[PDB]
Design an enzyme around this catalytic site. Sequence first.
Site, short mmCIF file in Angstrom:
data_model
loop_
_atom_site.label_atom_id
_atom_site.label_comp_id
_atom_site.label_asym_id
_atom_site.label_seq_id
_atom_site.Cartn_x
_atom_site.Cartn_y
_atom_site.Cartn_z
N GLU A 1 13.81 -23.97 7.28
CA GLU A 1 14.61 -23.92 8.62
C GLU A 1 14.37 -25.20 9.38
O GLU A 1 15.27 -25.77 9.93
CB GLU A 1 14.65 -22.70 9.27
N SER B 1 51.92 -30.38 25.11
CA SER B 1 52.14 -29.05 25.43
C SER B 1 51.04 -28.15 24.94
O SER B 1 51.04 -28.23 23.83
CB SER B 1 53.40 -28.53 25.00
N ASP C 1 39.24 -4.51 4.86
CA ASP C 1 39.33 -5.81 4.42
C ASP C 1 40.05 -6.71 5.46
O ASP C 1 39.42 -7.85 5.69
CB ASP C 1 39.84 -5.83 3.10
N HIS D 1 35.04 -23.78 11.15
CA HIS D 1 35.84 -22.75 11.98
C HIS D 1 36.51 -23.30 13.03
O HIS D 1 36.02 -24.42 13.82
CB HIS D 1 34.43 -21.99 12.58
O1 LIG Z 1 18.01 -28.31 12.30
C1 LIG Z 1 18.26 -27.55 12.97
O2 LIG Z 1 19.48 -27.28 13.27
C2 LIG Z 1 17.51 -26.61 13.94
C3 LIG Z 1 15.85 -26.65 13.39
C4 LIG Z 1 15.11 -26.10 14.52
N1 LIG Z 1 15.59 -24.84 14.95
C5 LIG Z 1 15.00 -24.33 16.27
O3 LIG Z 1 13.95 -24.69 16.52
N2 LIG Z 1 15.62 -23.16 16.84
C6 LIG Z 1 15.07 -22.56 17.98
C7 LIG Z 1 15.85 -23.50 18.94
C8 LIG Z 1 15.25 -23.38 20.44
C9 LIG Z 1 15.90 -24.56 21.30
C10 LIG Z 1 15.37 -24.51 22.76
N3 LIG Z 1 15.98 -25.39 23.53
C11 LIG Z 1 17.28 -25.44 23.89
C12 LIG Z 1 17.44 -26.60 24.40
C13 LIG Z 1 18.62 -27.03 25.17
O4 LIG Z 1 19.50 -26.10 25.42
C14 LIG Z 1 20.78 -26.48 24.68
C15 LIG Z 1 21.94 -25.71 25.20
O5 LIG Z 1 21.72 -24.24 24.93
C16 LIG Z 1 22.94 -23.66 24.45
C17 LIG Z 1 23.17 -22.57 25.29
O6 LIG Z 1 24.13 -22.80 26.48
C18 LIG Z 1 24.25 -21.80 27.42
C19 LIG Z 1 24.35 -20.45 26.70
O7 LIG Z 1 23.50 -19.42 27.16
C20 LIG Z 1 22.93 -18.58 26.21
C21 LIG Z 1 22.15 -17.80 27.25
N4 LIG Z 1 22.52 -16.98 28.17
C22 LIG Z 1 22.26 -17.18 29.59
C23 LIG Z 1 23.28 -18.25 30.32
C24 LIG Z 1 23.25 -18.29 31.49
C25 LIG Z 1 22.23 -17.41 32.34
N5 LIG Z 1 22.27 -17.53 33.53
O8 LIG Z 1 21.60 -18.77 34.26
O9 LIG Z 1 22.28 -16.13 34.34
C26 LIG Z 1 21.51 -16.38 31.69
C27 LIG Z 1 21.75 -16.28 30.29
N6 LIG Z 1 21.02 -15.34 29.68
O10 LIG Z 1 20.49 -15.41 28.10
O11 LIG Z 1 20.17 -14.42 30.28
N7 LIG Z 1 16.20 -27.25 24.55
N8 LIG Z 1 15.51 -26.42 23.83
C28 LIG Z 1 15.86 -21.03 18.03
O12 LIG Z 1 15.14 -20.20 18.33
O13 LIG Z 1 17.26 -21.14 17.81
C29 LIG Z 1 15.02 -27.00 15.83
O14 LIG Z 1 15.86 -26.81 16.83
O15 LIG Z 1 14.26 -27.82 15.60
ZN LIG Z 2 12.86 -21.02 13.95
ZN LIG Z 3 11.84 -23.87 15.20
#
Ligand SMILES: O=C(O)CC[C@H](NC(=O)N[C@@H](CCCCn1cc(COCCOCCOCCOCCNc2ccc(N(O)O)cc2N(O)O)nn1)C(=O)O)C(=O)O
Ligand SMILES: [Zn+2]
Ligand SMILES: [Zn+2]
Lengths: 694, 694
Positions: free
Chosen positions: A370, A574, A610, A633
């Site tokens: 991954e 539109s 389905d 998608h």
């Molecule tokens: O090759 C690949 O594709 C990935 C391989 C690997 N994958 C990976 O490590 N994945 C980890 C990645 C962790 C990444 C951490 N990170 C994120 C960032 C930058 O953020 C990018 C934008 O994030 C998208 C989410 O946008 C907002 C959506 O919110 C979801 C959470 N909800 C939320 C929103 C607002 C609030 N508030 O402020 O009240 C609260 C929440 N909550 O959830 O409480 N920098 N580091 C994972 O666990 O999925 C990698 O990334 O290197």
């Molecule tokens: Zn991971």
């Molecule tokens: Zn990771």
Amino acid sequence: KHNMKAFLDELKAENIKKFLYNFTQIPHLAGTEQNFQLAKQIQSQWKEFGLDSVELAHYDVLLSYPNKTHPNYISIINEDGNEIFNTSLFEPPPPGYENVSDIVPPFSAFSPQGMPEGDLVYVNYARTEDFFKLERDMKINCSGKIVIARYGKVFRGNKVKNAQLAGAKGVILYSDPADYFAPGVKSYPDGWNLPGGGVQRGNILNLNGAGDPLTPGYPANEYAYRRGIAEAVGLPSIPVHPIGYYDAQKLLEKMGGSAPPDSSWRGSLKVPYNVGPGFTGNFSTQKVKMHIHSTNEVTRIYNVIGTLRGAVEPDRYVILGGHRDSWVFGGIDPQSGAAVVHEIVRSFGTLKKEGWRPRRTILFASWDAEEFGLLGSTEWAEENSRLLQERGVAYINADSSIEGNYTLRVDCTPLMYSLVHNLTKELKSPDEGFEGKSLYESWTKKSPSPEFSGMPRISKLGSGNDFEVFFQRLGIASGRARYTKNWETNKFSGYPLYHSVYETYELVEKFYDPMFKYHLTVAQVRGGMVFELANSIVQPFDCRDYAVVLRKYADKIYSISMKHPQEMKTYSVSFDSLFSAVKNFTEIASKFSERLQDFSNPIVLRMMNDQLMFLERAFIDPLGLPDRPFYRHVIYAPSSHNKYAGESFPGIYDALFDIESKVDPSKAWGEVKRQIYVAAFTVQAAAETLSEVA
Amino acid sequence: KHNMKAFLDELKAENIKKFLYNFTQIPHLAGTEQNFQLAKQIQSQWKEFGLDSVELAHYDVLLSYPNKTHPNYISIINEDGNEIFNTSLFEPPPPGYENVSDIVPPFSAFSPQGMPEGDLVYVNYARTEDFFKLERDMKINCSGKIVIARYGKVFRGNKVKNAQLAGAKGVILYSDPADYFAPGVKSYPDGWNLPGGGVQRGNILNLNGAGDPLTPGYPANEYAYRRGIAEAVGLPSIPVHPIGYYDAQKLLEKMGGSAPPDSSWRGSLKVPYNVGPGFTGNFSTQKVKMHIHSTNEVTRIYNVIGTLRGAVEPDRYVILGGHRDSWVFGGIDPQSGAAVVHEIVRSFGTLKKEGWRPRRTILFASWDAEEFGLLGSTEWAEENSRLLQERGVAYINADSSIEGNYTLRVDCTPLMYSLVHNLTKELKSPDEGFEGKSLYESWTKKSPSPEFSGMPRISKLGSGNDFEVFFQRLGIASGRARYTKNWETNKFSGYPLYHSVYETYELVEKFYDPMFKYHLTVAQVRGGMVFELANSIVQPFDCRDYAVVLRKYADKIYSISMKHPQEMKTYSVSFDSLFSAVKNFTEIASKFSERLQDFSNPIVLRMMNDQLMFLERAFIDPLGLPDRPFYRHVIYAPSSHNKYAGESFPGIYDALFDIESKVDPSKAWGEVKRQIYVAAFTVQAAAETLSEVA
Ligand SMILES: O=C(O)CC[C@H](NC(=O)N[C@@H](CCCCn1cc(COCCOCCOCCOCCNc2ccc(N(O)O)cc2N(O)O)nn1)C(=O)O)C(=O)O
Ligand SMILES: [Zn+2]
Ligand SMILES: [Zn+2]
Ligand SMILES: O=C(O)CC[C@H](NC(=O)N[C@@H](CCCCn1cc(COCCOCCOCCOCCNc2ccc(N(O)O)cc2N(O)O)nn1)C(=O)O)C(=O)O
Ligand SMILES: *[C@@H]1O[C@H](CO)[C@@H](O[C@@H]2O[C@H](CO)[C@@H](O[C@@H]3O[C@H](CO)[C@@H](O)[C@H](O[C@H]4O[C@H](CO)[C@@H](O)[C@H](O)[C@@H]4O)[C@@H]3O)[C@H](O)[C@H]2NC(C)=O)[C@H](O)[C@H]1NC(C)=O
Ligand SMILES: *[C@@H]1O[C@H](CO)[C@@H](O[C@@H]2O[C@H](CO)[C@@H](O[C@@H]3O[C@H](CO)[C@@H](O)[C@H](O[C@H]4O[C@H](CO)[C@@H](O)[C@H](O)[C@@H]4O)[C@@H]3O)[C@H](O)[C@H]2NC(C)=O)[C@H](O)[C@H]1NC(C)=O
Ligand SMILES: *[C@@H]1O[C@H](CO)[C@@H](O[C@@H]2O[C@H](CO)[C@@H](O)[C@H](O)[C@H]2NC(C)=O)[C@H](O)[C@H]1NC(C)=O
Ligand SMILES: *[C@@H]1O[C@H](CO)[C@@H](O[C@@H]2O[C@H](CO)[C@@H](O)[C@H](O)[C@H]2NC(C)=O)[C@H](O)[C@H]1NC(C)=O
Ligand SMILES: *[C@@H]1O[C@H](CO)[C@@H](O[C@@H]2O[C@H](CO)[C@@H](O)[C@H](O)[C@H]2NC(C)=O)[C@H](O)[C@H]1NC(C)=O
Ligand SMILES: *[C@@H]1O[C@H](CO)[C@@H](O[C@@H]2O[C@H](CO)[C@@H](O)[C@H](O)[C@H]2NC(C)=O)[C@H](O)[C@H]1NC(C)=O
Ligand SMILES: *[C@@H]1O[C@H](CO)[C@@H](O[C@@H]2O[C@H](CO)[C@@H](O)[C@H](O)[C@H]2NC(C)=O)[C@H](O)[C@H]1NC(C)=O
Ligand SMILES: *[C@@H]1O[C@H](CO)[C@@H](O[C@@H]2O[C@H](CO)[C@@H](O)[C@H](O)[C@H]2NC(C)=O)[C@H](O)[C@H]1NC(C)=O
Ligand SMILES: *[C@@H]1O[C@H](CO)[C@@H](O)[C@H](O)[C@H]1NC(C)=O
Ligand SMILES: *[C@@H]1O[C@H](CO)[C@@H](O)[C@H](O)[C@H]1NC(C)=O
Ligand SMILES: *[C@@H]1O[C@H](CO)[C@@H](O)[C@H](O)[C@H]1NC(C)=O
Ligand SMILES: *[C@@H]1O[C@H](CO)[C@@H](O)[C@H](O)[C@H]1NC(C)=O
Ligand SMILES: *[C@@H]1O[C@H](CO)[C@@H](O)[C@H](O)[C@H]1NC(C)=O
Ligand SMILES: *[C@@H]1O[C@H](CO)[C@@H](O)[C@H](O)[C@H]1NC(C)=O
Ligand SMILES: [Ca+2]
Ligand SMILES: [Ca+2]
Ligand SMILES: [Cl-]
Ligand SMILES: [Cl-]
Ligand SMILES: [Zn+2]
Ligand SMILES: [Zn+2]
């Protein structure tokens, strides 16, 4: 009684703790012997636990590793070419691990080799808007410069793509304490903060869903034809390397040229955050030199695939999948998730040994590679795409179970919102202060929905994890859930020790979840979702929830367009067709829901199941989105500016993005209109899958 | 009893005769008012006949028509620019039709406008090999020349593509008596031969499955975004026009330059068949001038869609479809097929009125604009693709019921071979000499299988008819059947009066099938196939027959490659993976067949019926074949040299074609290897859909 409660009660925090300890004593880097041994262990245990079959599915994919005898590092060099400062060759290992071997040093996976020398430009987070500000407002040219960017805000692969397109000849990524050091908490081992010697590993590809760079569209099996490196998907063209903030301070402290344009460009180090290019007068003749010697190599990886055959609908698959490969010890990422999957398998297998089987088949997956671009999940899905698109009910991801200890985080398709609300009302909150209350109650109080009173926030799926092939390529309803931090009071990105050597069993046991109660809660949510999806007579999807969000997203994209009223007039742009489609979807989904509730006939049931299963499928466009054929998608794709974030109506979004800067507005607005047509058509076509079938 | 026999017995030759007469009194050109009125008539009658719903589905697609006040024609011009000979402005109308209005004059649909003048080059049938011979062997350059080609052997669209790529500035197509006049038979109205004033209409697009040129991938509905003409799919770049052999003789008789290279280049006219360029000495200063003024215009078309809802599996669709639009009267093409569909609907509706319903839903379609590129069927399938790919059991085409009176012709997927053998053993032969014998017996005697003693020939599907979207784009099991001529004794192409004004009701009634017994036989075959497909408890597909043909096709493509043994050695080109996949498919299909025969459980049944239904689906590659994204079936595509012909393993075939002429053999053989990998992978993936599901 064998029911959900029996399944949930069998789950134990102490088992999750034991498995986590077991999975995190040595590194499990993809493609290494240690990770193959762990694969075999999981295969053996899942058999022991009672699954009907458990097989390894292997592939030979492009991976990337530093050269053990020719270390990567960065220097400041003087006029003579003397290297007067060198970045670290490794992170200082944590207590008691100073003798562990085979810790991969910090590197950016898939960087090409090179030794570029040049003047630095500081580019903030290296976001699209950061480069806009530099080029358009500040008139700073990155062509032929080495850029230094702080990690955070967006996926590091987007940063590198952005720097390449600005003409950079190398990129240095670093962790600023502003984004990785929470005020008032101590650095590892005394707290959960990133020390100045800590460094975040991670790949820097831009695969857009392709999987193995060499075999887009087809599994990387024994006879696969591979692209040559020059035609590989998603590889960066300039060298890249990550460093910690002690080393960053030494590269930034001498920076000259322009001041930062405003405070959003300033981190927390005691430096000016000058943009450059280059160093101040005294040091103007000094330069920065990278030395990158990593190699890309085709390497075997191993997924473990466990099957628990369904009693009634064996040809319907509910999949619980998460990865097993880690950068180093994987204390949080992924083993806090893999330990939860292990305990879920154990609990399902306990019921099975007593004679129970789920209604539908459950597949359990321990994916490999991954960290190197979703490779194991993507290659398996490519191999099995026909089975998955005609039989796949849902995919539940299972990476990191925790990134904080405050409340629940769920990202999923609208089709699972009602399932999630219902399940969490039946689970106990693990939170202090909420003893005796439901998880729904604690979650809703801590993380209220922005749209609805008395409901919790559930986000769209983004990407950067193993659900990407299932959801955005194949159109299988997908979801994920974990415990998270308080987003209000915490300004840092993800968790501080992400992808560092400091992410250990001790980090979790001492600082995140000593009782393993948040892990157990996450096991209940992920396992409970799988249970319902696999056992419910009628699939637990509510099409009406898709209708509600589609209207929200249509309002949003219309609002973006309406920032350009003159052009919408000129080019007759539109949104009427898209709103019409959404209205039709809302009406048809309402009628389908009536029939579903109103309908002893297993054919009408399965016909209806389905229609429920193929509804996510209907949002797929076999032609893909522009220049991203594996993002199919039409409602959701990873943001073109940040793979971690999801974007709604992405084809229309990208057609509108920065449109006022396009040289040929007639062409650009024509493409907006084309994307509106594609989106309206796809929404109407998905609605029509819910109409009476004849 | 309501069984197949009841359905078959209700069909009447006299009804088919009455409908044919009714459908052929006036022209029904696509996009004209007369064809819309006929659509409404069919809609009304199918309702009368008892279908549950009958709707019109309309689209606005690019069509092409001559300019009524600026006629198309070709001249020979002298040095002064005097036009000394002009081709005809219309075919002389047949007896009793000399006052019929709205007969479209002969033209090539979708020709651009132009008045090119130049020297003629005669290019035989304008096949790929004809141009190879001219350019490579004879050293004749067509650049800037007008080419004259005889119709026959391949689709006229391929001829035009071939001439364009040779650099021609216009193309004249003509009907040679060698290919359209059977020795010993009289010209219409006294026999079934083409008179010298007769001309074959027809479109000259190269759509490769796209449908409407302006909206590839999406239905041409009310809000569709259309490409501009310059980006349209498949339009020719040079003017084209068809003529009869009286006029051709006047253009060819003066030809000079090189002699024909051999007798396969000589037709039957009293001319030398010189290749040119240009005319012999006395006439060397004369030139040929085209005058083409046709216009392409977006025009509304109407499909009629009738539904007979299934009693048990309403969400499974068996489709009987054929077109209704004609070039002129459509005596054979398509109304001999449309009359058969009409009588089939009538017979099914008779059973329905007595309280019967088929097990599965049957959809009946009267498509529009087939003549203009499969437009009506393709746009409807684009609109309904999600419903069709998850619910489509089979598609049975119903164009021309007869092209001769000798024996049966069936082209279909291997999955229908056993169904066809079985059905024809139960039907009566209509042939003289075979009174009291089965159709299987007469057919097998007259048209023996090349591979198997005691079985009849059944061919692969090619293209140039309305099954193309269903089979090669969507992967729905498809078939077609009609009465045909004796291929041994008849050297002409199709039937002589094809797409001429002479194709009338009288042609059919007087010369092809006065008793309508061959029509009735074809109604029994098409209707019987629909009946079985829609009513059988287990779908009537035999996966083992696919295994047999896959081995035949693998042997064939391997044999092509083995003409280049040195290159296979140099580039390590192995077919082992493809044979392995075919062997695996054979083994897995055999085991599936055992379970199917060995398995009261409607879920195991439907599970198994879905495995049968999705087997054709499994041969689809969502990425399409190279540069032909709408040809997605990996086993079968229309030949890249002749849209009417089918090619097996087309991706490997085209990678090998003319490979000894490629400038970079390493690249070319690399692409052969890539196509072998894609084919082996797809065959193995299709086999795995027949494995136990869990
Ligand atoms: O090759 C690949 O594709 C990935 C391989 C690997 N994958 C990976 O490590 N994945 C980890 C990645 C962790 C990444 C951490 N990170 C994120 C960032 C930058 O953020 C990018 C934008 O994030 C998208 C989410 O946008 C907002 C959506 O919110 C979801 C959470 N909800 C939320 C929103 C607002 C609030 N508030 O402020 O009240 C609260 C929440 N909550 O959830 O409480 N920098 N580091 C994972 O666990 O999925 C990698 O990334 O290197
Ligand atoms: Zn991971
Ligand atoms: Zn990771
Ligand atoms: O836009 C479009 O795509 C098409 C629109 C329109 N569509 C159309 O008119 N379709 C007509 C087309 C009739 C075309 C007639 N034609 C064919 C040709 C050239 O032939 C091309 C190669 O044909 C492919 C078949 O290849 C051999 C397969 O054999 C099938 C019959 N089997 C057979 C084989 C051998 C023998 N022998 O010698 O014993 C006997 C048989 N029998 O069937 O007995 N020239 N004219 C139809 O009814 O489908 C058009 O073409 O303009
Ligand atoms: C949402 O669902 C509704 C169904 O409740 C569906 O409504 C359909 O809308 C289309 C318009 O996009 C209608 O199309 C019309 O069909 C009639 C024949 O039935 C034609 O005569 C009309 O064409 C004329 O008018 C046009 C507009 O002025 C002209 O451009 C044209 O030249 C003709 O003069 C037109 O094609 C269709 O009838 C309804 N169907 C119904 C009501 O059942 C709507 O399309 C759905 N939304 C989406 C995005 O699919
Ligand atoms: C047809 O079906 C058969 C199943 O009956 C299927 O056989 C499979 O073949 C592949 C080879 O393509 C086998 O793959 C091997 O798997 C083992 C582990 O099980 C590996 O150790 C092997 O790799 C070593 O050897 C290779 C060849 O010398 C080296 O290149 C490599 O570096 C390793 O040293 C190899 O990957 C697989 O085991 C069987 N599966 C079985 C028998 O169940 C066959 O692939 C199917 N045909 C098609 C076209 O799919
Ligand atoms: C993780 O747990 C596994 C399973 O208990 C341990 O593997 C077992 O180790 C014992 C002692 O060597 C063997 O006899 C078993 O055969 C192993 N079982 C397997 C692999 O299924 C493993 O030792 C533990 N690892 C750590 C680091 O504690
Ligand atoms: C940074 O590391 C480089 C590379 O090891 C050091 O430069 C080397 O120093 C040795 C011993 O003096 C020389 O023999 C090599 O030729 C040097 N190599 C290069 C590429 O310069 C350098 O001394 C280190 N700098 C600091 C401050 O530690
Ligand atoms: C979530 O639970 C609610 C409340 O039980 C379910 O909604 C009820 O479903 C039953 C059974 O069909 C209906 O008879 C009730 O009228 C529904 N109540 C409502 C909508 O307030 C809902 O279906 C569950 N969602 C799932 C299982 O996905
Ligand atoms: C083809 O048959 C149809 C159906 O019988 C004829 O249409 C009918 O014509 C009569 C007399 O004009 C009308 O009263 C009916 O309303 C028509 N029914 C329809 C259209 O469903 C039509 O006249 C016949 N055409 C020819 C050329 O014979
Ligand atoms: C072929 O048709 C053309 C076009 O109608 C004829 O040429 C025209 O003749 C008229 C009357 O003599 C002139 O006024 C026009 O100017 C001519 N037009 C052109 C384009 O030449 C020509 O006579 C016809 N040739 C034959 C042999 O019938
Ligand atoms: C074509 O008919 C043959 C002969 O009836 C069918 O084959 C038989 O099928 C029955 C029912 O499963 C078996 O018990 C026999 O053993 C089969 N006989 C054979 C193979 O010789 C065949 O299934 C029919 N094909 C269809 C309906 O597609
Ligand atoms: C690693 O560097 C060493 C030492 O300089 C060199 O000999 C070797 O080729 C490199 N290894 C790889 C895999 O490039
Ligand atoms: C940036 O720098 C390089 C010159 O080294 C030049 O090619 C490029 O066009 C410049 N772009 C600007 C100033 O916008
Ligand atoms: C655990 O929760 C407490 C109480 O809010 C908090 O102070 C601490 O920072 C949390 N630990 C982590 C790793 O977030
Ligand atoms: C047809 O030709 C006439 C007469 O020369 C011309 O006026 C008209 O524009 C043309 N019609 C079309 C549709 O091009
Ligand atoms: C054919 O003719 C044209 C010259 O009019 C030329 O451009 C082209 O290259 C020629 N090709 C040959 C002789 O192969
Ligand atoms: C009908 O069959 C007879 C006898 O073989 C034959 O001579 C005649 O040509 C056939 N008619 C047609 C149109 O093929
Ligand atoms: Ca791949
Ligand atoms: Ca279209
Ligand atoms: Cl996750
Ligand atoms: Cl046909
Ligand atoms: Zn036809
Ligand atoms: Zn035709």
